[PDB]
Design a protein around this ligand. Structure first.
Ligand SMILES: NC(=O)C1=CN([C@@H]2O[C@H](COP(=O)(O)OP(=O)(O)OC[C@H]3O[C@@H](n4cnc5c(N)ncnc54)[C@H](OP(=O)(O)O)[C@@H]3O)[C@@H](O)[C@H]2O)C=CC1
Ligand SMILES: CCCCCCCCCCC[C@H](O)CC(=O)SCCNC(=O)CCNC(=O)[C@H](O)C(C)(C)COP(=O)(O)O
Ligand SMILES: [Zn+2]
Lengths: 95, 143, 111, 84, 342, 205, 126, 143
């Protein structure tokens, strides 16, 4: 789901859009602007919250040493889901 | 925000991080801002702009370096080149003996600062009026 | 302070005159032999203005080290270790000079 | 044509500023109240050759090196730069 | 002005200057020097290239990373021109040939392609047009390319009223066709001149001085709306010009006169080749015409660049054609040619 | 297993050799430092560097025939900022020695060509990189810098990126020089941690 | 060797090979650096450091990297004495600007001062 | 907090190029060579005493020297500021009437501190920090 500019080119997940009165699109004629279609902002609400039966949890990102270091995040806040600061996947308390 | 939409021409100068400048505190001590980030766009230093204005006019200002501006600071008032130095003042008694002859009247109106509450400390003098950080500070305070 | 060759200024000035004599002797051989795109007159004026560039120093050890640096430039000019590219970057045929007035320095950059 | 401003410099403990210190300790307030529109500025610092800079109209100035005077003719010096 | 067009820098290649220049016709001779003088300043130069990529490989070195961008186009349609010029600050037209062919003629090359460049530039919204004409361009002229240059000047002013028509004179450089014509006349053992080179006065002007005039004319705000005429500091007679060229080449110099009709017949005989011709009838008539006496026109001196003469930088040109017997000889050994105001 | 083991017998016998050379050459030797790394750092006076290295080469009980290394280290705090080292190495005694003298950039050091012809190139390299005159050299011709490079580059007042930078042009068809402005600024990192690192190497106030 | 008796200020402009604009249009700051305020360590501030005036740093028009006009802006230098630093600045000939060393003052801080009867130094938290 | 979170204002609503009054009546982006020429052309016409400059705020003490010389060479004493200080009795002269004559280290060296003018916590807040440090670490009567 890539949004388009008013000029007609693509917009990255950093929010960068070249303006209409800018010369820096002159390397953009007859050569394609590389924009990744899989936005990391859009690919984090697709996976649901992970249920935690305790008051704290510790993720790894999957794979142990392949993923991230094992941060113990707090699950005492029930109104907001406790996000892992390394990944960004969200945890919800079960009770 | 104020002086630029009510203007005829606008000459952009540098900011306080953006020029090798002298400022005075309330103690009388003057210190030097070294230049941290050079000013963006075509904006230059303020004395550079006024000296270029003098050159494009018919007025021969005697500046070509920053050190000649510091020498003119020495020639006009020699407290603004002695950096990190409060100079020892005196002679308040003559000012009191002159101001005793001033025939002015107070009246019955309660004196008040304009920064009465906490909501208007965060927006003064066109930098905190322009930042989105202090707009979020005023937005968080006024809820 | 310890000297280098000269116990005064005028003996080092005589060494400067000797090096200028040898440079003026050497430079039409490095105009003709170098297949260079200049005459000999502005090359000799370039040698003279490079002598006048460091004219302000009255220090004998600094001008003795200028004498050995001019001798190394002479040693790389009599023999042809320098080429037609290295020998005339001094003329600044490509680099535009920085302007000296206040208005053009105001227009060019924050300086 | 007229005297636009006068800027008088001053040291702290040097003996060469003692006459203008005597002028600023007794004979200043009557000079200021004789003409309150004309500002007789005082800019002191430490270890300065003491001067008076009578800046006239159109940017010109007159610099009098007021060094090593007495309790007699300092006020005649700046009344001379007021009259002249 | 936008926030990226703002010039900052000392003046080298990695500085920014905001002269976003569409340099049409930059694959040839004056285009290489003006793309060098534009990329040395620190500008974004876009070259619409018509040729292969090999002859525009050598223009990649002229500036910093991404300061040079090459776009493939064709002169038949306006769509590639509008695809080139719509992100531009200035557009500099240097297009043209010294010979016509079966696909393109002189009227098409000097008129309709600058009219299409001017029309697509005006409909794209560029700030400054610079066109390059000839100095001898007039409507009543006896040269086909000069008559085409005059009616192309009229059509460029009809489309765009603020175009800077720069009219340089004969240009001499390291890969020119002005001095290289007289140095390729060395092979034919006797140089032919119209009336022995006496009735024709030529003004040689240096190519780096011309390209510095173009680069300064992109930035001078007084110079907008005007029409210029670049010329050298010393007017030269043609007989003394070919005498000075063969004197610093040090070959034999036996001139002989033959008139203009049989010169045009031998130019048509040498210009019928399918390859690049050594001489054309238009190339004969361009170098065998008296140039205009320079009055009432702005030139090179008001653009801040001093015009270097023929006697200082043509030893950079003439070193290719020199025999080893007189290879290492410098300029002042040879007698310089007499300047003629008449 | 983490710490390197220390053999102090080499420390005391090379310290006895350092006291030996410091006694036999009292005119030139200013001090002798012995590190914890079983090597000697004899700091001498630059007017007499050739008696020191002829004594270190030709004597039967020093016998440092083979010179190995010769540069400066430029410390601009000192009045004589260049600190010229001579790392020499005995083949027969299997030992090493360091000779450190000082230099200003105006006070020359008399060259050591007559004792070692190994330093026919090392002193030329020092004349490029730091810029001290070497007395009675056969040729002190510049070696590592460009032909016409104004500026000794290994001093601390020379920058990292230099001053000239070469560039081809088609105006003149030469590899001409320009004053360097960078495509990318070299990001200077504050790698000095603000906490005290070694209590043994503590500077007194 | 005989000693030569001269007395002038020192210039090594021609030895250092710098351009003339990099002396005459540049000024140099000799300063003990400030302590980094999120740190409480003093080991950064024992050395007298030398920095230059900061020149123009723009964005590269392809990417947006910091492109500097000045090669001298990357340099910092380390001394241990202010007069030796001013000797180095006087021999290199740049326009000096020296900030004096600012030390902490000895303040009488005691734990028993923080819990006092008549004084206002009693802290409400613990 | 104002000066440490007002750095984000330095990259927002910032003047970069010189702007001029257009023929329609708007403010358009032009160059220094046109804008300062318009300033000098309208500055050589009006002279004497009807040329005034209101400075004040984030403005250097070198900029005031250059402005003071450039407007005293067109012989006008019309150099006004933002905020009002009285010059009816002992205004600009005798530097004990607009300074902190006691040292800010000597704010510790006090006994009774009166504040008639303003609250210090929303107006020069580090002065409020020094008066709180003195008020805590010794007995001090603030009124
Ligand atoms: N004769 C002279 O000395 C003088 C000439 N002039 C004129 O000014 C200009 C100076 O340019 P100059 O470098 O000398 O000329 P060149 O012929 O050497 O270069 C111009 C370039 O234009 C390109 N070009 C021409 N016609 C077309 C076309 N129809 N389609 C695509 N590309 C085209 C060519 O590219 P490619 O062949 O690589 O595809 C050529 O490389 C020319 O117009 C010239 O006529 C001005 C003053 C003096
Ligand atoms: C084509 C190839 C080109 C290759 C080109 C190569 C150019 C570089 C050549 C090598 C560099 C050259 O040695 C530089 C030097 O000698 S520098 C010091 C000169 N010595 C002094 O400064 C001492 C004081 N001497 C005076 O003051 C004199 O009287 C003076 C004549 C200067 C007048 O001074 P004033 O009075 O104006
Ligand atoms: Zn995780």
């Amino acid at each position: 789901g890539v949004q388009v500019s008013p000029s007609g080119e693509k917009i990255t997940h950093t929010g960068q859009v070249y303006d209409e009165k800018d010369y820096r699109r002159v390397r953009f004629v007859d050569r394609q602007k590389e924009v990744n279609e899989n936005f990391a902002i859009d690919l984090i609400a697709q996976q649901p919250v992970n249920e935690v039966e305790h008051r704290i949890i510790a993720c790894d990102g999957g794979g142990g040493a392949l993923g991230h270091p094992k941060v113990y995040i707090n699950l005492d806040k029930e109104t907001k889901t406790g996000t892992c600061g390394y990944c960004g996947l969200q945890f919800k308390q079960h009770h | 925000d104020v002086g630029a939409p009510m203007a005829d021409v606008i000459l952009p100068g540098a900011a306080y991080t953006e020029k090798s400048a002298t400022y005075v505190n309330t103690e009388g001590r003057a210190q030097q801002t070294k230049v941290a980030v050079t000013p963006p766009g075509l904006a230059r230093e303020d004395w550079k702009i006024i000296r270029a204005l003098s050159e494009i006019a018919g007025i021969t200002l005697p500046y070509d370096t920053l050190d000649q501006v510091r020498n003119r600071l020495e020639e006009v008032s020699p407290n603004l080149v002695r950096y990190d130095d409060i100079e020892e003042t005196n002679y308040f008694q003559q000012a009191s003996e002159l101001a005793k002859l001033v025939n002015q009247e107070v009246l019955a109106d309660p004196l008040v600062p304009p920064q009465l509450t906490i909501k208007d400390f965060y927006m003064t003098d066109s930098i905190s009026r322009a930042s989105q950080t202090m707009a979020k500070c005023v937005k968080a305070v006024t809820e | 302070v310890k000297p280098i060759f000269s116990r005064d200024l005028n003996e080092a000035k005589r060494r400067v005159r000797e090096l200028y004599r040898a440079w003026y002797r050497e430079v039409p051989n490095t105009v003709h032999l170098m297949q260079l795109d200049i005459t000999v007159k502005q090359g000799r004026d370039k040698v003279r203005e490079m002598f006048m560039k460091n004219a302000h120093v009255t220090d004998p050890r600094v001008v003795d080290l200028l004498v050995i640096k001019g001798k190394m430039e002479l040693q790389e000019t009599i023999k042809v270790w320098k080429q037609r590219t290295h020998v005339m970057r001094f003329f600044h045929e490509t680099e535009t000079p920085r302007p000296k007035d206040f208005l053009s320095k105001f227009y060019m950059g924050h300086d | 044509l007229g005297l636009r401003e006068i800027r008088v410099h001053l040291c702290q403990r040097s003996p060469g500023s003692q006459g203008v210190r005597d002028f600023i300790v007794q004979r200043y307030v009557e000079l200021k109240k004789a003409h309150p529109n004309l500002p007789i500025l005082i800019r002191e610092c430490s270890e300065v050759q003491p001067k008076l800079w009578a800046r006239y109209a159109f940017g010109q100035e007159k610099t009098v090196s007021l060094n090593n005077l007495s309790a007699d003719e300092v006020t005649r010096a700046m009344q001379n730069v007021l009259s002249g | 002005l936008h926030h990226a067009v703002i010039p900052h820098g000392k003046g080298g290649r990695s500085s920014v200057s905001g002269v976003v220049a569409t340099v049409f016709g930059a694959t040839g001779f004056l285009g290489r020097y003006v793309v060098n003088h534009l990329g040395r300043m620190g500008s974004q130069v876009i070259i619409p290239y018509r040729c292969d990529v090999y002859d525009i490989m050598h223009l990649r070195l002229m500036g910093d990373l991404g300061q040079l961008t090459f776009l493939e186009w064709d002169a038949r349609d306006k769509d590639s021109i509008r695809k080139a010029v719509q992100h531009s600050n200035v557009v500099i037209n240097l297009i043209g040939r010294e010979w016509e062919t079966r696909n393109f003629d002189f009227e098409d090359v000097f008129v309709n392609i600058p009219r299409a460049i001017a029309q697509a530039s005006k409909e794209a919204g560029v700030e400054r047009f610079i066109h390059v004409s000839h100095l001898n361009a007039s409507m009543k002229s006896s040269s086909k390319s000069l008559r085409s240059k005059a009616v192309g000047e009229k059509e460029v002013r009809s489309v765009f009223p603020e175009a800077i028509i720069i009219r340089p004179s004969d240009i001499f450089g390291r890969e020119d066709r002005f001095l290289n014509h007289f140095a390729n006349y060395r092979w034919f053992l006797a140089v032919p001149l119209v009336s022995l080179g006496f009735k024709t006065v030529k003004q040689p002007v240096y190519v780096a001085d011309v390209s510095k005039g173009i680069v300064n004319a992109t930035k001078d705000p007084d110079a907008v709306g005007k029409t210029f005429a670049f010329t050298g500091p010393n007017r030269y007679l043609l007989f003394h010009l070919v005498k000075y060229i063969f004197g610093m080449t040090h070959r034999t110099f036996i001139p002989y006169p033959l008139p203009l009709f049989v010169y045009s017949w031998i130019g048509k005989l040498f210009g019928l080749s399918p390859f690049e011709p050594w001489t054309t009838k238009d190339k004969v008539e361009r170098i065998h015409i008296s140039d205009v006496m320079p009055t009432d026109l702005p030139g090179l001196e008001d653009l801040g660049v001093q015009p270097t003469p023929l006697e200082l930088k043509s030893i950079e040109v003439l070193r290719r054609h020199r025999t080893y017997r007189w290879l290492s000889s410098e300029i002042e050994e040879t007698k310089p040619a007499k300047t003629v105001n008449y | 297993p983490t710490v390197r083991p220390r053999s102090d017998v080499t420390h005391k016998q090379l310290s006895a050799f350092g006291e030996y050379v410091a006694e036999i050459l009292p005119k030139y030797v200013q001090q002798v430092q012995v590190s914890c790394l079983d090597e000697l750092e004899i700091c001498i006076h630059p007017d007499g560097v050739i008696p020191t290295l002829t004594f270190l080469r030709d004597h039967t009980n020093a016998q440092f025939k083979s010179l190995a290394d010769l540069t400066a280290v430029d410390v601009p705090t000192r009045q004589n900022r260049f600190e010229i080292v001579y790392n020499l190495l005995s083949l027969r005694f299997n030992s090493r020695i360091r000779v450190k003298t000082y230099a200003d950039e105006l006070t020359p050091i008399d060259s050591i060509v007559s004792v070692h012809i190994a330093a026919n190139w090392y002193e030329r390299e020092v004349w490029d990189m730091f810029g001290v005159f070497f007395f009675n050299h056969p040729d002190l011709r510049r070696i590592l810098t460009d032909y016409g490079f104004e500026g000794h580059p290994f001093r601390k007042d020379f920058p990292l990126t230099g001053y000239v930078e070469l560039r081809y042009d088609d105006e003149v068809k030469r590899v001409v020089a320009e004053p360097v402005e960078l495509a990318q600024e070299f990001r200077k990192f504050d790698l000095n941690s603000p906490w005290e690192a070694f209590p043994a190497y503590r500077q007194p106030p | 060797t005989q000693l030569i008796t001269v007395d002038e200020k020192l210039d090594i402009t021609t030895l250092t090979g710098v351009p003339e604009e990099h002396i005459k249009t540049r000024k140099v700051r000799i300063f003990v650096p400030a302590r980094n305020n999120m740190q409480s360590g003093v080991n950064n501030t024992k050395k007298w450091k030398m920095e230059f005036d900061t020149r123009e740093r723009w964005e590269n028009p392809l990417m947006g990297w910091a492109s500097t006009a000045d090669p001298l802006s990357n340099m910092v230098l380390t001394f241990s004495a202010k007069e030796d630093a001013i000797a180095f600045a006087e021999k290199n000939g740049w326009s000096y600007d020296v900030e004096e060393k600012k030390v902490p003052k000895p303040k009488s801080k005691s734990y028993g001062a923080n819990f006092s009867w008549n004084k206002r130094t009693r802290v409400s938290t613990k | 907090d104002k000066t440490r979170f007002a750095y984000d204002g330095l990259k927002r609503q910032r003047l970069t190029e010189p702007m001029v009054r257009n023929e329609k009546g708007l403010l358009t982006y032009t160059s220094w060579e046109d804008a300062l020429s318009r300033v000098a052309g309208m500055l050589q016409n009006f002279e004497g005493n009807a040329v005034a400059a209101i400075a004040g705020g984030l403005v250097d003490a070198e900029a005031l020297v250059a402005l003071k010389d450039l407007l005293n060479k067109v012989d006008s004493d019309n150099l006004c500021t933002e905020e009002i200080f009285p010059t009816e009795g002992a205004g600009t002269d005798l530097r004990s009437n607009y300074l902190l004559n006691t040292t800010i280290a000597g704010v510790e060296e006090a006994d009774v501190v009166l504040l008639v003018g303003t609250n210090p916590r929303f107006e020069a807040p580090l002065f409020n920090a020094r008066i709180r440090k003195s008020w805590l670490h010794n007995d001090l009567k603030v009124a």
